[PDB]
Amino acid sequence: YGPDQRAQKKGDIILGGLFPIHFGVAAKDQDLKSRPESVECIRYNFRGFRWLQAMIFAIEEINSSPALLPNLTLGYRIFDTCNTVSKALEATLSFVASTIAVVGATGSGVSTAVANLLGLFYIPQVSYASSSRLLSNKNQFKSFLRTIPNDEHQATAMADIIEYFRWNWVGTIAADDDYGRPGIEKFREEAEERDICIDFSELISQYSDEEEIQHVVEVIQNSTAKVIVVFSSGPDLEPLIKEIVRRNITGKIWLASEAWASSSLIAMPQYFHVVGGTIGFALKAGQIPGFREFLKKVHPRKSVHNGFAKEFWEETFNCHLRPLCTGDENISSVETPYIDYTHLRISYNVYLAVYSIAHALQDIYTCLPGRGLFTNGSCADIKKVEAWQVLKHLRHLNFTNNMGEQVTFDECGDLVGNYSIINWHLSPEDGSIVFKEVGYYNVYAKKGERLFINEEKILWSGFSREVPFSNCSRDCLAGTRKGIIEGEPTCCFECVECPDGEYSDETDASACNKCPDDFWSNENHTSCIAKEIEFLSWTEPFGIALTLFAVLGIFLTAFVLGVFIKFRNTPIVKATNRELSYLLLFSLLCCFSSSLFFIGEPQDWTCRLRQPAFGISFVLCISCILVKTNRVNLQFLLVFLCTFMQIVICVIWLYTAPPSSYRNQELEDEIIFITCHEGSLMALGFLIGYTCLLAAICFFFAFKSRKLPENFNEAKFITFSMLIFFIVWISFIPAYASTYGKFVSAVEVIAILAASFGLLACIFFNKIYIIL
Amino acid sequence: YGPDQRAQKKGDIILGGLFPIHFGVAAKDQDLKSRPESVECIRYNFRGFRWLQAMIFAIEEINSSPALLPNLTLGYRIFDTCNTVSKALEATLSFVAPSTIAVVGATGSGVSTAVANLLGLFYIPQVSYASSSRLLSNKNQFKSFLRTIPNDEHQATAMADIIEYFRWNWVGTIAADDDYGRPGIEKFREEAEERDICIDFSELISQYSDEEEIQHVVEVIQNSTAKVIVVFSSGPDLEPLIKEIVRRNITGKIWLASEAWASSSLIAMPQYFHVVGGTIGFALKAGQIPGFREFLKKVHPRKSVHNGFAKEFWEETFNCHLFRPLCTGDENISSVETPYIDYTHLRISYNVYLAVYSIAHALQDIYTCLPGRGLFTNGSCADIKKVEAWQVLKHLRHLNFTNNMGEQVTFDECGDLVGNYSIINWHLSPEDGSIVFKEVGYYNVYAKKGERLFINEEKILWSGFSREVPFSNCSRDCLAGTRKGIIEGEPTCCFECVECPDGEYSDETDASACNKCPDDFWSNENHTSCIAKEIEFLSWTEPFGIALTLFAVLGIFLTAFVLGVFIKFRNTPIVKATNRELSYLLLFSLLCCFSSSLFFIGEPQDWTCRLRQPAFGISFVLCISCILVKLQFLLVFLCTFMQIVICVIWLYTAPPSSYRNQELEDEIIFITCHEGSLMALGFLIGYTCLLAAICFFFAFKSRKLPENFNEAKFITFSMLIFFIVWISFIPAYASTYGKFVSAVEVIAILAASFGLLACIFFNKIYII
Ligand SMILES: *[C@@H]1O[C@H](CO)[C@@H](O[C@@H]2O[C@H](CO)[C@@H](O)[C@H](O)[C@H]2NC(C)=O)[C@H](O)[C@H]1NC(C)=O
Ligand SMILES: C[C@@H](NCCc1nsc2ccccc12)c1cccc2c1OCO2
Ligand SMILES: C[C@@H](NCCc1nsc2ccccc12)c1cccc2c1OCO2
Ligand SMILES: N[C@@H](Cc1c[nH]c2ccccc12)C(=O)O
Ligand SMILES: N[C@@H](Cc1c[nH]c2ccccc12)C(=O)O
Ligand SMILES: *[C@@H]1O[C@H](CO)[C@@H](O)[C@H](O)[C@H]1NC(C)=O
Ligand SMILES: *[C@@H]1O[C@H](CO)[C@@H](O)[C@H](O)[C@H]1NC(C)=O
Ligand SMILES: *[C@@H]1O[C@H](CO)[C@@H](O)[C@H](O)[C@H]1NC(C)=O
Ligand SMILES: *[C@@H]1O[C@H](CO)[C@@H](O)[C@H](O)[C@H]1NC(C)=O
Ligand SMILES: *[C@@H]1O[C@H](CO)[C@@H](O)[C@H](O)[C@H]1NC(C)=O
Ligand SMILES: [Ca+2]
Ligand SMILES: [Ca+2]
Ligand SMILES: [Ca+2]
Ligand SMILES: [Ca+2]
Ligand SMILES: [Ca+2]
Ligand SMILES: [Ca+2]
Ligand SMILES: [Ca+2]
Ligand SMILES: [Ca+2]
């Protein structure tokens, strides 16, 4: 028979309906000491009553209009589910015990149970609010069609919003039923496809225990993420919100699904300091003329067909039929969600479901023999119509709304729809919560072009304007790279500085970069500068300071030669071998010239001659000075033999292993020296040793004859010059052995100039002075 | 009402049952051109028929029992579900319409949910034997559901435990899109995230999935690189994907099976063994029912009047009709190989047995009571004549009894039992080629968190014919010389091995960042451990140190010998020619100046480098003061006084000390002692040079003279060698750094001192 409380009217064709007039059942749990009784409902639902009114209005208008079903009256039989499976199953047993269509339930689990029962007898069921993707399976739910889309697009939209605002550190919360779980799974898949890290994920219910509530609250508090995505309804979300308000946890960003984005259970001013600035999804609104007047024309006395109106009035005016009420009140004098609304969405879905059933019936009525949807093109009988025939016509139906929009059901009985994005604000007039549109979501568009948000219209946490931060890690700038933190996701990391020789340019770099082998890292490891070249050369202090002196010395020896040629007749110049003084002076010229190879860029030919040139010149000079004394042509044989021995040594050295240039970068890694090694060391030792031996022989021979004052005391000055040569060579040995930079080149030229100047002066100063 | 074929008997109390005698319905595109008819299920289920026989046997045993419910008969009313929700609601609508007191539940979790929604309306107890979904464990929605099987939270935790125990971190998952696979896979995902395990892919399958979906799932499996796949499904829902994978020949995966298909005969076939061999799965505890095999063998299409499925069972077993040939109801049931009588362990059959006996024990507890000792309001009882379903449910909630083995059976506040698990492995029969499941472990539940799993490796064949544990990590481990690096867009599971730079090292094998050892250390070439920094200074053991020491000691003894010969020959007129006392003091000062070069040897200490310079300054100023004059001790003291002043005030102000150089090289440290303030060192240098220059001038003023054996030019030469040797020092001092700065220092000191001694005392020594 069904529950006593009902709405019912008599007609030729009867329609069923299920609406949640209450929010749930009483908390008392029976221990089965006595006979179980009927469980009672506790809280009222003005929105659900409005939905029921919408269905009744649609049926009454259909019966009024003589263009949809002439000569045919439609009846209804509507019950209350109280948001629970047990009460909705009792009514469905009365439906199948006749109705040809049922306007479905609100919750997904309730709709699943009702559809399981109703598909046994092929009674079509049109739901207005159940959006679970599990109801699209046509192998299980053979009679289920709906006027609302499923939540795959809504989860994709949540991921799109998260990617738009550039967050990667979020938490999720879902209700423990067929609405929350599939939605949170689809969101998890999309988020992991978009590289988003989820911190925690918990479940809740309207009948959750205190320990579970505390545990969820403590997880939320212990987490460091700020954005929380919630897939639930108001009845299942209220206890957690109450506990969170009690614990005073603020500063979080909420992303709501459509089921509670506009719920009056949560949108309370006492909670606004926690759930302010909420961003959610809301479906498209429709328009139904005359509906508000129909709603305000309710009365427990003239609504004989309706039964819930008595309890409606009692819970509206707080009376009984706690003072007694005369029934003369006004619904406009009390503030309830009943007539206080701005947009109708699920009421419009109710309207659409009723009109879908009516249009299928009219399609059955109109068809002509031979042009049918049944076997042999036959046409159904309107006076004996059946539920399966109505279901077939519903699966082959499309029509046009009152706004000119076209309604078509797909192969899964699903429709396609648009979403809108709203933000929660505080009304400055009375402190109530107002829902302000800030965007939308387009489903007919392509991937990546479905979402539009006006950020300037969004208030964050209710009273701010700066986009929040939820990332688990502050990005580190150039010159540093990311480092793994163990046991944590990829979104959380530490940054460390890049070492020498490597650098990073772009932010959020996972590895430093090495510059090619002519560069070095900067001071901050952001750009690799050029490797500085360093070597003694011209246009530099030491180079000019040394060649200017080389030019001065070459001019001095040229002048000396000029004085000698001019005075080629004075007897003082005579008895000093004219054939050997010129050779000595020209060798001095050559030594001064060879002192110029040591300064410059070390090409492969400068370093093949810079040493042998000076060796040859000095051996020639010492050979000249070792025979110039008459206490010994045949004298030219000595200079020729000495110079030829030296030349032989240098040529065999150059044949076995010529020296070459060398770019040096091993001593230091920031500056690269271009200094040329000598190639071989035994031959260099030969070259040095021959000259040192000749110098020693000359020193000994001159030390033999110091006392003689003939020839202006030649031997003493010879000893002086050989001495200065020897000490100036000995002094710089550690510098020669500690080759570091460009100082080694300078000391070579210093020694060359010192020795040559000493020899020239000690030989010719007195001779020129007495001459002039 | 209800289906035509059924099992039914008469009694005072009637029991309901639901068993899957078919694997599913003949699905087809039913266009609604004509009135829809009843659908027909196709594939016969011998295991389901065995479960039905277990229920019937239990009821017959209870009726034969005199102790349990005497003078009372139990009846039954059993239907077939064909594994579908539609065919189970048709049967349930007759249960709630002789009244039914209890129903032995269904197999599938979704079917059980749909049935329980309707049975809890009338408070009819429902005891399921195979539904293990955790959604059925909340008592707000399901008021009269109990089960003789545990729920899947323990199984998911055990799967995570096994994965962690075998050291894998790269897996994929596959589930069935029903109330069984999804919550189980979700619990597994949470456990694996807790245990730091990585999931590559996660797909859904169904018995009625399409070709495109099956090929897409196969392509996901082939594209992925993981080897271990965790599956939460049943045989009917898993068959199509397995057949497609077998056709495409994808070999080399590791399968971890839940108890629904771990022993399923649909998947365990020799043809598929090359894809699903070496499967590791779960199984419940096995029971013992002593008189069950004979009862099963006693089936007959004519003697079993009360059984309606016996005729179809016979037809499917013997391929005949009651063109399929005619048959005789006298064949042998032992000559055909079907899962009917062929089995080693009864698990779901034992659960069916336990459900029936638990309902019986609740009824007996109702029957025997003492007034004032009842479970109802005023201690009163019910009556077995007019017992009711809610009273039976109350007693079932307050039931606690022991089975035939001797184990206590009781239900908690959620209606669930607790039970053990066994771990099995799929092998190949060496005699028949079939698939034989061999026990390899178990999973305790009464143990504390972390000691529940026991596994014995050596009994496992990994791919079917392999004896080595497979590798299923995203990337290979790093070494001690290298650390891991982040790959952008990929999880923390796989990485790249990046070598540490100079000055840093790593020790472990999975280091995420390599540190650095403190000062006086440096990383080696292999970057595994770091050697200590090498110290460097002019050491005595070094040959240069020994050479300088011998030179200084030789100079010391030479001056001592000169002093001794002067003292002994103090009567020679040549000693009186010059001053004897000044010669003595000058000799002692030359001794001091020679010995003052031993401070430049060894590791600089706090005082040594605070005295190396003042000693030489004082000694050389005395020596040159002696030469200049040569009373006179007054002038030598006056000349030394200002040097003493400068050195002592410098030591008071900024005493030098040893300093360590760590910023010049990498593996070599230097101890080059500070010079303090450069002003005092420069003042020392300048004053001693000025005195030497004054000596040079006053010696060159009278360089030509024969007195004192013509020594003025000798003094001039000594000062010349002093100046030149201390001038030809900067080009070797500025351009050299290291252990050579304190190497030519001693050279210059010794050269100057030896010259000063030889240019003076040699002539006077020669004549003597
Ligand atoms: C928070 O993290 C997100 C995600 O990594 C960052 O957004 C990225 O920013 C970089 C650098 O500009 C862009 O190249 C990426 O395209 C962004 N990702 C996305 C998905 O758009 C964001 O910059 C981070 N914010 C802070 C403050 O660190
Ligand atoms: C000026 C001198 N150059 C020798 C450079 C040198 N000497 S030792 C050492 C150690 C390490 C590195 C370099 C060096 C020279 C050249 C040619 C003939 C010579 C001669 O001097 C004697 O005859
Ligand atoms: C032995 C020396 N003390 C250290 C001198 C010194 N240290 S670094 C340096 C660099 C360039 C030149 C000199 C130095 C010394 C002491 C007193 C008088 C001296 C004298 O030498 C000249 O007269
Ligand atoms: N879509 C929700 C039902 C729902 C939609 N809008 C609502 C508003 C209030 C309450 C419930 C709802 C579900 O599947 O369960
Ligand atoms: N546990 C499975 C049912 C099940 C258990 N063992 C089985 C063996 C075969 C078939 C089904 C089953 C479920 O809840 O759905
Ligand atoms: C929708 O209705 C139109 C009439 O405007 C009809 O032509 C069409 O076949 C119907 N179906 C679809 C899928 O467009
Ligand atoms: C959905 O929204 C988009 C963007 O505003 C619009 O173009 C489209 O027409 C809308 N569709 C419907 C059916 O309203
Ligand atoms: C069930 O009975 C046994 C046997 O006496 C007893 O040990 C056990 O505690 C009982 N169960 C409960 C839940 O009390
Ligand atoms: C489960 O296994 C453990 C360890 O093997 C054992 O102690 C325990 O008795 C088992 N449980 C049952 C019910 O047999
Ligand atoms: C795989 O990874 C785990 C977890 O990081 C590690 O312990 C194990 O040693 C790895 N296995 C191999 C074979 O490298
Ligand atoms: Ca009409
Ligand atoms: Ca409802
Ligand atoms: Ca609401
Ligand atoms: Ca972790
Ligand atoms: Ca009995
Ligand atoms: Ca079943
Ligand atoms: Ca099976
Ligand atoms: Ca990615």
Swiss-Prot record, chain B:
Extracellular side: 1-542, 601-606, 654-677, 737-740
Region (Cysteine-rich (CR)): 474-544
Region called Ligand-binding 2 (LB2), residue ranges: 151-286
Residues covered by region (Intracellular loop 3 (ICL3)): 698-713
Keyword DNA-binding on entry: no
Subcellular location: Cell membrane
Consequence of changing residue 155 to A: Reduced calcium-induced G-protein-coupled receptor activity
Result, substituting residue 100 to M: In HHC1; decreased G-protein coupled receptor signaling pathway
Result of altering residue 670 to A: Decreased calcium sensitivity
Effect of residue 142 to C: In HHC1; although the mutant receptor is expressed normally at the cell surface it is unresponsive with respect to intracellular signaling (MAPK activation) to increases in extracellular calcium concentrations
Impact noted for substituting residue 482 to I: In HHC1; decreased G-protein coupled receptor signaling pathway
Protein residues bound to spermine: 200, 202
Residues listed as glycosylation sites in the UniProt record: 71, 223, 249, 332, 378, 400, 420, 473, 526
Stated consequence of mutating residue 177 to G: In HHC1; decreased G-protein coupled receptor signaling pathway
Origin species: Homo sapiens (Human)
Region described as Intracellular loop 1 (ICL1): 569-580
UniProt name for this protein: Extracellular calcium-sensing receptor
Effect of residue 741 to W: Decreased activation by positive allosteric modulators
Binding residue positions for phosphate: 47-51, 347-349
Membrane topology reported for the UniProt record: Multi-pass membrane protein
Site residues by UniProt (Important for ability of agonist AMG 416 to activate G-protein-coupled receptor activity): 414
Tissue-specificity statement: Expressed in the temporal lobe, frontal lobe, parietal lobe, hippocampus, and cerebellum. Also found in kidney, lung, liver, heart, skeletal muscle, placenta.
Keyword entries, A-Z: Calcium, Cell membrane, Disease variant, Disulfide bond, Epilepsy, G-protein coupled receptor, Glycoprotein, Membrane, Metal-binding, Phosphoprotein, Receptor, Signal, Transducer, Transmembrane, Transmembrane helix, Ubl conjugation
Comment field on protein domains: The extracellular regions of the homodimer interact in a side-by-side fashion while facing opposite directions. Each extracellular region consists of three domains, LB1 (ligand-binding 1), LB2 and CR (cysteine-rich). The two lobe-shaped domains LB1 and LB2 form a venus flytrap module. In the inactive configuration, the venus flytrap modules of both protomers are in the open conformation associated with the resting state (open-open) and the interdomain cleft is empty. In addition, each protomer contains three anions, which reinforce the inactive conformation, and one calcium ion. G-protein recognition is mediated by the intracellular loop 2 (ICL2) and the C-terminus, which contribute differentially towards the binding of the 2 G-protein subtypes G(q)/G(11) and G(i)/G(o), resulting in distinct CASR-G-protein interfaces. The C-terminus confers selectivity for G(q)/G(11), while it contributes less to G(i)/G(o)-coupling. The C-terminus adopts opposing orientations for G(q)/G(11) and G(i)/G(o)-coupling.
Span of the entire protein shown here: 20 to 860 of 1078
Outcome when changing residue 180 to S: Abolished calcium-induced G-protein-coupled receptor activity
Disulfide bond residue pairs: 41-82, 198-493, 320-327, 369-381, 474-494, 478-497, 500-514, 517-530
Binding site for Ca(2+): 62, 65, 68-69, 81, 107, 132, 150, 152, 193, 196, 259, 421, 489
